[PDB]
């Protein structure tokens, strides 16, 4: 649809953890299973082939027997430095995640997260209605990723105490 536009989410987090510890959260299966679109208790399946061009597949338990399936690809993996991945399998577009890890002087890491997602324009939508749907979608994604990263934060914290 020539008319579908992207929302973009930009998130900066500062952690005391080393870039290596944060990068690991993104690239290790039994860590990702705890935070990335899933959690320890709701995770049904996770497969992750963590190399460039490799697939991941997360099945997450929702209410009343329903399931969420999340699949995508690692496009770029540079050690302690950079992950580019898709949400969506190259019906329905791929969202893009690009996340960079920088070492601070002081802390462990500055984490710079970028996300791009195509929002579908509905039949007969006014300019305002479309703009309102992208704003709602953006705020929902900001909130869902915040909740994820702060979950990711405790998963990292509890490998540091246990």
Interface contacts to Na ion, rule CB under 5 A: 70, 88
How many other C-beta atoms lie within 10 A of the C-beta of residue 126? 8
Task: Report which residue's Cβ sits closest to Na ion.
Answer: 88
CB of 156 to Na ion, least distance (A): 25
Q: Which is nearer to Na ion, 60 or 108 (CB)?
A: 60
CB of 16 to Na ion, least distance (A): 32
Q: Which is nearer to Na ion, 87 or 156 (CB)?
A: 87
Q: 3-state SS of 141-159?
A: HHHHHHHHHHHHHHHHHCC
Q: Which is nearer to Na ion, 92 or 122 (CB)?
A: 92
CB of 18 to Na ion, least distance (A): 30
CB of 108 to Na ion, least distance (A): 30
- Kindly list the strands in the beta sheet with 5-15, ordered across the sheet, starting from the edge strand earlier in the chain: 5-15, 109-119, 95-103, 82-87, 67-78, 55-61, 43-48
Residue 113 near residue 99 (C-beta atoms within 8 A): yes
Q: Which is nearer to Na ion, 70 or 119 (CB)?
A: 70
Q: Is 150 exposed, middle or buried (0-12, 13-18, 19+ CB in 10 A)?
A: exposed
């Amino acid at each position: 649809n020539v008319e579908n536009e992207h929302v973009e989410v930009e998130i900066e987090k500062l952690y005391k953890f080393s870039p290596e510890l944060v990068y690991e959260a993104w690239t290790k299966k039994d860590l990702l299973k705890q935070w990335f679109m899933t959690s320890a208790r709701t995770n049904k399946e996770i497969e992750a082939d963590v190399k460039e061009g490799g697939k991941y597949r997360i099945v997450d338990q929702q209410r009343n027997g329903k399931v969420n399936v999340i699949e995508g690809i690692y496009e770029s993996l540079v050690m302690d430095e950079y992950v580019k991945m898709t949400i969506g399998m190259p019906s329905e577009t791929q969202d893009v995640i690009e996340v960079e890890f920088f070492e601070r002087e002081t802390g462990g890491t500055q984490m710079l997260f970028y996300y791009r997602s195509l929002v579908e324009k509905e039949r007969r939508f006014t300019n305002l209605e479309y703009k309102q749907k992208k704003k709602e979608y953006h705020d929902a994604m900001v909130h869902g990723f915040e909740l994820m990263f702060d979950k990711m934060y405790h998963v990292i914290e509890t490998s540091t105490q246990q």
